[PDB]
Nucleic acid binder design. Structure first.
Lengths: 182, 67, 77, 144
RNA sequence: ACGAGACUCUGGCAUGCUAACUAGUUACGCGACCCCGGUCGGCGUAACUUCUUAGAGGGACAAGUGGCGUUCAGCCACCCGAGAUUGAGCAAUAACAGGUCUGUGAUGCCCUUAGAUGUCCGGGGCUGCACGCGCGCUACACUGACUGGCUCAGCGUGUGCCUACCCUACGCCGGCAGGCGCGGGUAACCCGUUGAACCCCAUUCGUGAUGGGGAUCGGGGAUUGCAAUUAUUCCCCAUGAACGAGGAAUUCCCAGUAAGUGCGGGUCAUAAGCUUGCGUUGAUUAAGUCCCUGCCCUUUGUACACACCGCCCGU
RNA sequence: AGCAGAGUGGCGCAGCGGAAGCGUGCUGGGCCCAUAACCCAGAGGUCGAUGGAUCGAAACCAUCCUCUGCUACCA
């Protein structure tokens, strides 16, 4: 079962995100945001590059990850607009670093929940709120509040025991975090 | 943007020549009902005639040519 | 992009029968396709169950066709 | 009735092959090799089992009844032109053959054709089209 | 003067005219069935052309009205009206090293002419298969597949010259493919009121490479023909592959049109996935443009004229 | 004798738990009257080898082999 990454249901404007392209279309295309529970976005043909293009499949490449910046977000109707043309290479390194650390935290906690054998979207939301979202809101860092948390809690049990989630599941998650992040 | 532009309903008065690269669109002389003095020219796409009402999302743009 | 491979059961067990008996007569629009989608059952089983409740008098028939049948609930009062 | 009965067998092991009980009994035994859609209707018509029932809820008496009907077709008023092997080249009798027997009979028939070195056996040994059709354009996935 | 137009064929209508036992309608009588009337492509004979058939004629001409236009050639819309642009046939000067010597007792020249490149018979090949391309047929399913019932057409063709080979109603046998006796038609007379398919109604199936799709492959039985193996064609039972709406690119069409769907003719002893016609159901979009690919006229420039797929400079 | 770099498609190279790609070489197709430019698709991989924990390593661990950057022949 899959769950969303951060507590924001939709990203804010001018935010970088690692996007997998799903299918090419006529007026635009159809894509999927990895770190927002696979919601359908859109990239435009005019938002590909500033220069002239001679092959639409040379830079789109459906089936490949791409870094895009959010342009317009409409939470009322679920409309997401993306832009690859405005993406600068300076934030790109921080982008896949944040994406990799968030996906490793999500993979570790999903493995812990699969060991715990709980198959419900609300159950994953509640356990991941008890595990990561609380300390993410405490440290005030989107994405940066999990990798440093497990790095500081791999050698310190008192830092990891501050969350009042459970006892046996908390010990299983602490053992899974200490086994991987070593 | 921070601007919720009110929509305008406007009524055509005459049909000008058909612009565009392949002639897909045509030019009309259109006028409003809330103020029946202001008349602007708009590029409209589709089968039009004399008497149909057009829904203009903005009323401050003047019709560009084919290019 | 979730697959979620379907396994539509052929014969009714203990629990799906009485959830059907408590939920299907409280539905505004009753169709074999939509009750097979809601209860994750096979289409012939849905047709047999709606025919059984039609014979039981808890289901009001509206229109009958070779492509679909349309059923509706009864009045509460 | 519409509720599932007790000891509803999910799978069957009729002639050492897995047969599911979810399919219709007129079509679940079609998965047995050597018995098709048309042959399954006659077997279930000579035997007194209605074809509106499922496969996994029938009992062992009628199961073994239709099993002995399938291995013995002709002694239950089944005509001789309904058989997949009529006037066999070795023993010369009408006998419907089943899955592993069908593979064995086809293998020894191809071996007999290769032994007598006919054109059909030579084309079967080479691995080409044997029924006599054009091979200039069609049949591209035979080799790489 | 030619081309266009004008002309010819067909479609769309006239309850008016000319005539129909090889086409019918309406009345009357007989006959069958039901509960006093209804049904009968059951039988027969008193008028007629309402259906059908096919001849002469009629009708549409931008005729009437209102706008635009030198108020000229014309354009737009509307009323009455079966139609206010039906579809085709024919189609000028000048040429293409366009295709055909394999349509010809149309033919120049060249080759061969008795161990023949003539002719005839027997066998084989034209199908052969690591691959590429074009025109096509069937599908990827639930607006669907299977199983019953109900119900509706129009173009045609049909017993042949030396030439042998036609289309079939009815009765029996067999699941079917088929076989045997009997009759009709040289044809509005008989097949035939051509009980066509797609559709319509009602079960079974339930999103599963599945009852989709039928490739590949095995066995048996009939017909044609002197002869079917390299399976002629058909029928029956098994075998159940790829295929989940198709990349770059590209074809055809705007009204009973595209598309779905079946039936005739040509090849035919045996015979349609091809071609040419016919009828059934029946749409979306558009009344514009010169952007792409081209065409017609005029002006301009040219070192090209087997004519830009031209010409031509230098290391 | 010993320490580190590297072992990936014909060649060069990126990749570290949810996972065989890029540039380029070959073949085929399209575009054009034709060729060169241009576009598309496919084939080609024990990720050097072994064993283990790990739900599951091209990767985490230990060893071996190969070529360089280096101390050098050290009884």
């Amino acid at each position: 079962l899959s769950c969303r990454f951060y507590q924001h249901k939709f990203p804010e404007v001018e935010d970088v995100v690692m996007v997998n392209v799903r299918s090419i279309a006529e007026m635009g295309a159809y894509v999927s945001l990895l770190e927002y529970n696979n919601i359908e976005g859109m990239i435009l043909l005019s938002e590909l590059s500033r220069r002239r293009i001679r092959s639409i499949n040379k830079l789109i490449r459906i089936g490949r990850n791409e870094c895009v910046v959010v342009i317009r977000v409409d939470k009322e109707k679920g409309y997401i607009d993306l832009s690859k043309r405005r993406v600068s290479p300076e934030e790109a390194i921080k982008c896949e670093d944040k994406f990799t650390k968030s996906k490793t935290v999500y993979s570790i906690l999903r493995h812990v929940a699969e060991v715990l054998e709980y198959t419900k979207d609300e159950q994953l939301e509640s356990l991941f709120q008890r595990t990561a979202w609380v300390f993410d809101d405490k440290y005030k860092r989107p994405g940066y509040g999990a990798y440093d948390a497990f790095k500081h809690a791999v050698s310190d049990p008192s830092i990891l025991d501050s969350l009042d989630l459970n006892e046996d599941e908390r010990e299983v998650l602490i053992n899974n975090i200490n086994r991987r992040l070593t | 943007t921070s601007r919720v532009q009110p929509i305008k309903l406007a009524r055509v008065t005459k049909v000008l020549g058909r612009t565009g690269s392949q002639g897909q669109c045509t030019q009309v002389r259109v006028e409003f009902m809330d103020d029946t003095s202001r008349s602007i020219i708009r590029n409209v796409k589709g089968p039009v005639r004399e008497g149909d009402v057009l829904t203009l999302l903005e009323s401050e743009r003047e019709a560009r040519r084919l290019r | 992009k979730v697959r979620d491979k379907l396994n539509n059961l052929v014969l009714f067990d203990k629990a799906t029968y009485d959830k059907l008996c408590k939920e299907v007569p409280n539905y505004k629009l009753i169709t074999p396709a939509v009750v097979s989608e809601r209860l994750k059952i096979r289409g012939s089983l849905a047709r047999a169950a709606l025919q059984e409740l039609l014979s039981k008098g808890l289901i009001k028939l509206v229109s009958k066709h070779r492509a679909q049948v349309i059923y509706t609930r009864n009045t509460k009062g | 009735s519409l509720v599932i009965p007790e000891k509803f067998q999910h799978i069957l092991r009729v002639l050492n092959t897995n047969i599911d009980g979810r399919r219709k009994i007129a079509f679940a035994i079609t998965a047995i090799k050597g018995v098709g859609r048309r042959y399954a209707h006659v077997v279930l018509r000579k035997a007194d089992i209605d074809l509106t029932k499922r496969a996994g809820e029938l009992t062992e008496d009628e199961v073994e009844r239709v099993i002995t009907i399938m291995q013995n077709p002709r002694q239950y008023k089944i005509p001789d032109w309904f058989l997949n092997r009529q006037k066999d080249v070795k023993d010369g009798k009408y006998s419907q053959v089943l899955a592993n027997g069908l593979d064995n009979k086809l293998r020894e028939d191809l071996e007999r054709l290769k032994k007598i070195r006919a054109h059909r056996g030579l084309r079967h040994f080479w691995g080409l089209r044997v029924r006599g059709q054009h091979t200039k354009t069609t049949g591209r996935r035979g080799r790489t």
